[PDB]
Amino acid sequence: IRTTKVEQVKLLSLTGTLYLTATHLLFIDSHQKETWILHHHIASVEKLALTTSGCPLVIQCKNFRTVHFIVPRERDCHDIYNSLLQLSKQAKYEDLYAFSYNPKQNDSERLQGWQLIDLAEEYKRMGVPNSHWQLSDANRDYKICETYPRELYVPRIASKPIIVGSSKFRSKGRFPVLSYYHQDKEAAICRCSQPLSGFSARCLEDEHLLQAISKANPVNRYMYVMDTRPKLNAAAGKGYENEDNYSNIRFQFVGIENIHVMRSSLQKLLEVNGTKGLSVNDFYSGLESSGWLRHIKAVMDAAVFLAKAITVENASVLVHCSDGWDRTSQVCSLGSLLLDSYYRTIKGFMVLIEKDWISFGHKFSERCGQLDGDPKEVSPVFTQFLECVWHLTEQFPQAFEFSEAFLLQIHEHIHSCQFGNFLGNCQKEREELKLKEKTYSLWPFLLEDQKKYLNPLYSSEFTVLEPNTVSFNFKFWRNMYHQFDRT
Amino acid sequence: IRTTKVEQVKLLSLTGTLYLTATHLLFIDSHQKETWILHHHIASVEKLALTTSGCPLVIQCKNFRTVHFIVPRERDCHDIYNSLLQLSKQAKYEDLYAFSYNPKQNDSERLQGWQLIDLAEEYKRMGVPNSHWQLSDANRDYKICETYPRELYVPRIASKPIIVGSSKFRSKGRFPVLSYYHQDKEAAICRCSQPLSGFSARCLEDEHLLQAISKANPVNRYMYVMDTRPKLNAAAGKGYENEDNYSNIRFQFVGIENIHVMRSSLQKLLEVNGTKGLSVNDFYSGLESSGWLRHIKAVMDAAVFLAKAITVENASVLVHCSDGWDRTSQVCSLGSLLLDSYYRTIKGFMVLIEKDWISFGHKFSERCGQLDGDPKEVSPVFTQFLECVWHLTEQFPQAFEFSEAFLLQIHEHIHSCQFGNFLGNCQKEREELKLKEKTYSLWPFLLEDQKKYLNPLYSSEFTVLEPNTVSFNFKFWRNMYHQFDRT
Fold this sequence. Notes:
The structure is a homodimer.
Chain A: E1 2-8, E2 15-20, E3 24-29, E4 34-38, E5 42-47, E6 55-61, E7 66-71, H1 74-87, H2 108-114, H3 119-125, E8 133-136, E9 152-155, H4 160-169, E10 177-182, E11 187-191, H5 204-216, E12 223-227, E13 249-253, H6 259-273, H7 280-289, H8 292-311, E14 317-319, H9 327-339, H10 346-359, H11 364-368, H12 381-395, H13 404-414, H14 427-432, H15 435-438, H16 443-446, H17 450-453, H18 478-484
Parallel strand pairs in A: 11-14, 12-13, 12-14
Antiparallel strand pairs in A: 1-2, 1-7, 2-3, 3-4, 5-6, 6-7, 8-9, 10-11
C-alpha cells in the first residue's frame, strides 16, 4: 500500500509519499529524504479525529522519538493505523492459551485448584520444621533471592545474618537451602548455585552455613558437593568451594554437559528421527552420533550417586553445579524420587515438580520459549528429566503408580501453555502476573483422568530403587520424539 | 480468516477448523482440542506441492516442535502461508536503512570511506608506541576481550601474562587500557571496568598492571581512580580497588547516576516539552523536576576533574565506574576534548567518537534500540555526551571548528541508521555483520557538507579549556528536545 501527498509535521513540515510493507513504514520526502520506521520499533500509535486538513496519525518509537503524520484521506489513514497495530504487536504471556481457556469453573472451583498443592504440608510431611531445621522469613518479600520461593528452610543453628551473607557470595543469590530432608536417616539434600570463589575470595557466613548443614546431620559430619569438571565445563570464580576453607567437604564430578550441548544434541536427534528415506543401521548411528542417550545416562548417574550417598554412607549432600536451576533441579528431583515412595505417587509426583522446579525457579519461559526471548537460553532440561523418569518405569514396571501416559501428558501441557503452572521462570513473576487469579491449574485436571495414566501392575505401597547403567540398557524413547514431529 | 475441514497430520490425524488472527494461528479439533501457535513462536514455514488430498503446510516452532497441516484448497493455504511469513518476521539489522541506502558509489569509493579513519594513525599522532607504551596482540582475535578493539595499547613494562590475568579480574574483561596519552605532560587517560573485588579477592596481575601505568608516568607516581559512591549507586564485588592492596591510588566520586535514571529523567523531559497548554513557570518547574540539567552538569564535572588531574597536578587517571562503556565513555571523551585541540576539529571529532565509542564497544544497538531488545537496556548516554559538547560551544564560541548543526546531524544519523557506523554494540559484531562490505560510512558524507556545520567565528589553531559550573549557566537545549517531538 502507498499514500501520496502525506505531511510529516515539523514546526522548525514537507510533503511526500508514505510506503507500507511488512518490514517497515517508509516516508520519502519531496526531495529524497527517506525516514524509516521498522514495525518492531513502534511503541504506540494513535489516530485523532479527522481535521479540515487531514487525519492525524501519531507514532511513538522505542527510542522515545514521536512522529506526526497527516494522511489526506481518513480511509487511507484507517488502513495504515489498523495494519500498524497488527505489525507492532510484541510477545506477551496474555497471548497464551491459559488466559483464554475457561472450562465453565465458577471461580470458586479455580481457587481450590491452586490450593490443591500446599508445600507447607509437604515440608511438614517430612517433619520439617524440627530441632535440626526451621523456616526463614528471609524471602518473605523476595528480599534475599529473586529466583527462590517466599518460604525457605535452613538449619535451626544457622541464623538470619548467616543467610544474608551466604546469598551475597552465591551466584544469583541461590544460597544453600533444604531441597529434601530424610526423617529416618536424618540426612539432607540441599540445593544452591556455585559460590563466587574468584581468586581467593572468602565468605565466612557461607563457610558457617555449610558447617551448619553438616552439624545438622547427627550421623555424618562429612558433607558432599556435586559439580562439573575438568576445569568446570558448565568470570568471578571457578565455582568450587575451596576444600582448604571448607574443611568438611568431598567433591564429585557430575560430568553432565551444559544446556547448549543439550539443545544441540536434541537437534541432531529430531533431525534423524524427523528425516525418512533412511536405514535401520544409519538411523541409530545418527541417533547415537547425537549422544542424547549419553546425556540422559550421565543425568541418571548423578541421581544414582546422590541416592547412594544418602542410603549407603549416610551424609548430607549439596547439589549446585553452576546456577542450581537446570542440572541441579534434574539431580535433586531424580535423586529424591529414588529414595522416597511418596514421590512415585500420582499426587506425590505433582508435589515433586511443584517444589523442585515451580517454586525453586526453573526457567520454563526461557528454556521452553513461552515468548520471543533468547534462542541460546532454550534447552530440553525438563524433557531430559521426564525421559529419565521413563527409563525408571521401564526399569521398575511395578514401583510407579503412573505410566508412560502421565509423563507424556505432563510434557504436552508444558508445550501447550493451557494451564498457568509452568508460566514464567520463577515464583516471583508468577505472583506478579497474577496467574492464581487469571489462569487455571493443570494438577487438578490430571486428578480427574487418573484411570488412563494409572499403572495397574503397581504394588500398593517404602524402599530405595537401584537403577542400573552399562550403556546397553539405555535405549531411545520413540513416543517422546513423536511429540516434536508426528511422522 | 477461517479454513474448515483441515487435517493436523499425526501417525500415532483428526480433522478440524483452522483460525488465523494477528496474535496466533489456532486449530480447533473435531472434539474441542485447541492447538495454539503464536506467530512470534514460528521459526520456519514451508509449503510443498499440492497433492490429490490437499496442500501441505509445515510449521517449525521455536521449541523444536514441527507441525504438519493439510489445507484442502491451495488458494486458502497460499493466503495462510503468505500471512504467516509476514507475521513471523523477527527484528534484524538487515532491515535498517544502511543496508538499502545506495548513493551510486562504484564500491571502490565505499572501501575508501571506511579507510578514512585509521586509529593506528591516531595513536601514532600521540607518539604511541614509544618506550613508555606499546601495542598488544592480546585481542588480535578478540581472545582477551569481546567488547574491546582488536588493537590495544598497554605499558611497555607490563607483559602478555599480566594482561591475561587482569582481564579475568575485571568485569566483562574490560581491563585497564590506554584511552589517551598526553605526549608533552607524559600523563595518561586509561579506561577499564570495575574490578571483581568481592569479599577479599586479590589479583596480582591487576595490582601489577595499575602499578605499570603509574610507573609509566615519569612525573607522578600517584594515580587516580574515578567511580560512583555512596555504597556504589551504578554481586561479586563493590567494584572498588582496595586502597590497601593498591598502595598507589586516590579515589574520587563521579556522582553520575546509572542509565535507568538517565532514561527516566529524559521521559519526564520529553513529557514536559512534548505537552502543550502549559505555563512558562510550570514548564521549567517540570523541566527541572526531571533533573536532566543536574545530570549533564554532573557529567561535565567529571570531565572538569579528569582534565584538572592531567593539567594542574600531572598524574595518570583510570576511569571505570562499573562496566566502563557508558559514563566511562562520556568522561574519557569530554575530558580528552578539554585538553586536546585536534579533537575540537571536524575530522578530529570524528576520530574521537570512532575511538572512544565505536572501537571501545559502546552499546549503541542496546541503548538506542536498533532491534527489539530489552527496554531497560535503553538510555540517552551518547545524547547526554553531545548535549555536553553543545554547552562547551555555548561556553567557548570560538574554540570549536563546528557548531550546533554538526552535533544535531551526528544525532540524526545515530537515530536513522542510514550509515553502518553505530550499528551494533561492539567492534567484534560490526566485523561479523560485514558492515565494511554491506553498508556505507557517515564520516565521509559529513566531510562534504562541512560548510553548513563549520563555525566561521573559529580561531585558526593549543591550550586547555576551563568550563564553569554553578547550576545557573546550565540551561535547556530546545533544538535537541525538538528531534524527539517536532512540536
